């Protein structure tokens, strides 16, 4: 089994202060709702990706499914800000989070899993139909469902997701229904 | 064992549905409630059911009967809980000084 | 009135040691008790605190005396906040 990435959240400093009204009026697919939130929400189409551009020149880029695709979408957002007229430098690009999900191909019985690992797992069925297991060494949060689908979140690199899944796989096989 | 693991599964996974209690409370208030009210009110009522069944199985163990719960152990459960003030009735103006 | 808690309450009685197959009359008594408890709590909550509004704060003051119920409300609220933070 391999976990495929579903969501990459990155951040990039453009270095130049922006007034948001000209970007909202000139650029396409740009949404600005200040009485609601203080950023410009611009979406692109080729890589299905969304950017929140802030007035201090920092940009949050969400939605891509690899590191190179997130970097390429961030470059596209920087050049569409640039060609409007602002002098925009690609100062620092950092990926805040990487999210992956996988299916372990059997039903899982969660009550023994909270019974034997109650130090790291918080499970409340009514609030959410999933078990939050916190891995202490990778620093990942895993939502483990009864149907067999596991969602790994809270990672910076890919190898952390891979090592967390290889860590939590023998426990899940030990607790098969 | 193999029944204790099934019983512990039903002790945790069972809940009253939030789509009906939000319909039930709003028929008493008149206008609207919030999600953090319905989350708490669905949780207290599970403790209150667990206050009765854990005490109605004390009535059945006191008398000479088995685990199936007849209503005799359930009217007696509300009687013993009310004498310890656990069951609140806001229609009986009580008076302690006589 | 119909029964809005017929199948849900049978899982809960099994959760506290009754049987896998309880009696319909016992399930009916439990459902009536739950509806009465919810109604009483809602009236007292409307009286206490903001008149005509039932809030979490009012519900918490009402359940303060009973230890088992107060602990459950606090745990559920804290866990809800934690799950929202994780999301």
């Amino acid at each position: 089994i391999v976990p495929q990435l579903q969501n990459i959240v990155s951040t990039v400093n453009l270095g130049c202060k922006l007034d948001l009204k000209t970007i909202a009026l000139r650029a396409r697919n740009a949404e600005y709702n200040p009485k609601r939130f203080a950023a410009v929400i611009m979406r692109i189409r080729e890589p299905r990706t969304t950017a929140l551009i802030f007035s201090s020149g920092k940009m949050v880029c969400t939605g891509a499914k690899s590191e190179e695709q997130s970097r390429l979408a961030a470059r596209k957002y920087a050049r569409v800000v640039q060609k409007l007229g602002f002098p925009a430098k690609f100062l620092d690009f950092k990926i805040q989070n990487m999210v992956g999900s996988c299916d372990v191909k059997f039903p899982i019985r969660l009550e023994g899993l909270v019974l034997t690992h109650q130090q790291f797992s918080s499970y409340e069925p009514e609030l959410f139909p999933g078990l939050i297991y916190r891995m202490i060494k990778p620093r990942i949060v895993l939502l483990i469902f009864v149907s067999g689908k596991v969602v790994l979140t809270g990672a910076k690199v890919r190898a952390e997701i891979y090592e967390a899944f290889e860590n939590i796989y023998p426990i899940l096989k030990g607790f098969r229904k | 064992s193999e029944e204790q693991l099934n019983r512990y599964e039903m002790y945790r996974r069972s809940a009253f549905p939030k789509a009906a209690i939000k319909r039930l409370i709003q028929s008493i208030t008149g206008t609207s409630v919030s999600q953090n009210v319905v989350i708490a009110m669905s949780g207290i009522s599970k403790v209150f059911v667990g206050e009765v069944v854990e005490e109605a199985l004390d009535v059945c163990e006191k008398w000479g009967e088995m685990p199936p719960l007849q209503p005799k152990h359930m009217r007696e459960a509300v009687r013993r809980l009310k004498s310890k003030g656990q069951i609140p009735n806001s229609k009986h103006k009580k008076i302690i000084f006589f | 009135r119909k029964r809005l808690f017929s199948k849900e309450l049978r899982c809960m009685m099994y959760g506290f040691g009754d049987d896998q197959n309880p009696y319909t009359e016992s399930v009916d008594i439990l459902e009536d008790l739950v509806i009465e408890f919810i109604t009483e709590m809602t009236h007292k909550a409307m009286s206490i605190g903001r008149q005509g509004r039932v809030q979490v704060e009012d519900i918490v003051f009402l359940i303060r005396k009973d230890p088992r119920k107060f602990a459950r409300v606090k745990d559920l609220l804290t866990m809800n906040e934690e799950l929202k933070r994780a999301r």
Partner: peptide, 26 residues
């Protein structure tokens, strides 16, 4: 989408195991 379909699977097994036959009492 994962939260929407998995919520009803905690309750679907709560209608297959418990309460198979319906009883009554005098």
């Amino acid at each position: 989408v994962n939260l929407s379909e998995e919520s009803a699977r905690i309750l679907a097994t709560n209608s297959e195991l418990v309460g198979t036959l319906t009883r009554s009492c005098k």
